[PDB]
Symmetry: C2
């Protein structure tokens, strides 16, 4: 009579069809996080709910009532700034914390000419709050993230309470605009900012992830360690680079495969799994196999202990359900 | 044989499924009495696409096009780029065009007015040798298929002899003229409109670009091919959504992307014979209708000559019926 969780994760989700829930990139690796991490945005639990502010999809990021500004007395070829307060996203029915799709990363301040490291970047524009019309001189790539102190003392924050949702173009716009209210419109699939062509570490690192009050953390349980799902994500320093680039492979991480997030958002799985258990799947390769476990908070784990080495899924054969297990029982790692 | 029944389920048409052209949330079914064709990001029941795109929305990239702009003043110019169809040597699916390049004929424009019914995406020109984006060229670009580039652009819907072209709809900081030059554009597009008002559903059938071998969806008796409609952003009013005072803008695709993905992962060639549709029943708050899927991957409704969009807001459930003759009229009680 109870719903089964076994179909939440299936072979295509990790062999090329499944995309991650932060970057919408094709999942190709598992990144262990021995230090633990938290994530709420676009992350669902087994009770049908999210602590975040985003639906399980990638469309656009829009807010009608922020403050657009720029520095100096000449609007030509400036960096465009925009911000609103967290809690002001009144048109988002999920949560007013931030616009649906706004990235859960702390802002990396920059004034140029260098490009910030490890920023979430999306393409978009400022727009006219009354008419909807885009300000055509403001289209650019913008870093988006959470901060305090805008506009004058911008500092990263990872707590949504009292934060500001900020945007700043990483390159000059044709003509900046200074207007409050003004709208922001940015496409919801992002790229990673880098200072030059070289790839950087997997992005976001745990200490950049923004969460709302009450978001549960993923902590190690014995030798079981939480994992993120890694995809190869485009970067600003070399937009051609993909897997295997001579300039380095850039990984972006998410807490869940989006198909899992979607399944959790469609049905309540509370009956499927007791708190303190994991539901376990086996990932089989030619050389061996490994188990990953899903907790009631929606986080995945592997039996990798202190390791931070990315697990490559290029040679993954299939995913098979194993069943529910105590979270303390060590997940097999036989690669 | 594996059954087609699981290809189309309730979430695919009640909010989770996005269309295979715009990646928008499907909220309507648009009948096309005259029939239409689509190959890009469209799969059939024999595991085949005739298009050039994988069943996902990532980015559009080509390393070896020609960037240019009109005149000898690079400041605040409209940026142009093209390459030939057939030159997408790094796309394993097909070298016709880069993966994700939209299957729409280009709408020419000189500015400053914005073209009607163009596919628009955000991106930039980039350096073919280093990979570095040309940061003065970031903009919204209209992409589509044409001939005659760069100086005499003619829309085309035939990939044979075509060019894949891009032109910024608004001025860039500084244009570039280089060959080779790369194009990088994000794959989820928006619709260009001349002003705030919504236009007709986009693309209309006569704008859809196809390759050799692509089959057409023709009406079978009173059964008419449909597209799947989503509310897609438009350049003239980026805040408009469903119900806007400025009109609701629909973008259409030939399939729900969950269907495309299912057809790409398993072969359904024994599950259905030419001449048959696989039928599901769509139950609404008030009434119901049948939808049929043909072996060529096109969907149908029993709506005859009607052009009126079917609103899915009150759709409750999708339930499989099974294979039925395509000549039997699909029920429509809405």
């Amino acid at each position: 009579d109870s719903i089964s969780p076994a179909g939440l994760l299936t072979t295509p989700d990790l062999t090329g069809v499944g995309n991650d829930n932060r970057w919408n990139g094709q999942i190709v690796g598992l990144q262990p996080v021995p230090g633990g991490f938290s994530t709420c945005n676009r992350h669902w639990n087994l009770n049908g709910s999210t602590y975040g502010w985003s639906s399980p999809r990638f469309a656009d990021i829009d807010h009608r009532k922020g403050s657009a500004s720029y520095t100096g007395s000449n609007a030509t070829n400036v960096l465009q700034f925009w911000y609103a307060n967290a809690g002001s996203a009144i048109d988002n029915p999920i949560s007013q914390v931030a616009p649906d799709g706004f990235p859960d990363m702390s802002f990396v301040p920059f004034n140029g000419p260098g490009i910030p490291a490890a920023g979430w970047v999306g393409f978009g524009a400022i727009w006219n709050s009354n008419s909807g019309a885009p300000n055509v001189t403001t289209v650019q790539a913008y870093e988006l993230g959470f901060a305090t102190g805008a506009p004058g003392n911008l500092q990263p924050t990872t707590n949504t309470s009292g934060a500001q949702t900020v945007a700043k173009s990483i390159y000059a716009v044709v003509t900046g605009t200074a207007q409050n209210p003004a709208g922001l419109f940015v496409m919801a699939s992002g790229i990673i900012s880098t200072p030059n062509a070289s790839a950087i570490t997997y992005t976001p690192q745990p200490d950049r992830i923004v969460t709302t009050p009450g978001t549960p953390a993923a902590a190690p349980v014995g030798k079981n360690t939480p994992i993120m799902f890694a995809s190869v994500v485009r970067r600003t320093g070399d937009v051609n680079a993909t897997a295997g680039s001579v300039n380095g492979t850039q990984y972006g991480t998410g807490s869940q495969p989006l198909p899992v997030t979607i399944g959790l958002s469609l049905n309540n799985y509370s009956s499927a799994l007791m708190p303190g258990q994991f539901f376990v799947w086996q990932l089989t390769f030619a050389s061996g196999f490994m188990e990953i476990g899903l907790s009631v908070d929606g986080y995945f784990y592997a039996g990798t202990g202190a390791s931070t080495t990315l697990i490559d899924l290029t040679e993954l054969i299939d995913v098979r359900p194993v069943g529910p297990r105590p979270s303390k029982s060590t997940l097999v790692f036989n690669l």
